[PDB]
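Good morning N.,

You mentioned wanting to compare the apo and holo forms, so I went ahead and generated the holo version with nickel (II) ion. This is what I fed in:
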Amino acid sequence: GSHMNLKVEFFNAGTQAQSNSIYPKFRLTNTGSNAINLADVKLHYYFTVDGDKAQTFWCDWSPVGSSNVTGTFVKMNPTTTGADQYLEIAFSSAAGTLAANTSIEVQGRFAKSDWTNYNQADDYSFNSSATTYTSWDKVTAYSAEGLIWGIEP
Ligand SMILES: [Ca+2]
Ligand code: NI
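and this is what came out, ligand included:
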């Protein structure tokens, strides 16, 4: 009612269909009056891997400190349209809190261990058009309560 006032905006920094990396950019805004503990916030980006390989996420920049933002990869089960995996982004306790009426960006990249290609065009979360942050319901966010933003595939 006031405990999940996290607005999520998104765009892709690189929008090549055949791409050796995926470039998720999130902007998270606390739209309410109470602080949000980032350690409990998770984000998902859903995609089809187009050849499974070890993958790595890097956070290149966030005001909370990029080393405090990490990513892991999980398989969808069952797979569905546009989604056989998701990236899950998490924040450490050192990321701190997101104050009332403030926002942070989370900018990063992921790639396969052998740098082989993805097809971005079929990915559930991919936005082929946005060049700026946009309120995007095809990425999801979570608190300790579970889902707080978006539509899971
Ligand atoms: Ca794909
Ligand atoms: Ni609430």
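The radius of gyration is 15 Å.

Happy to go through it together on a call whenever suits you.

Best,
F.
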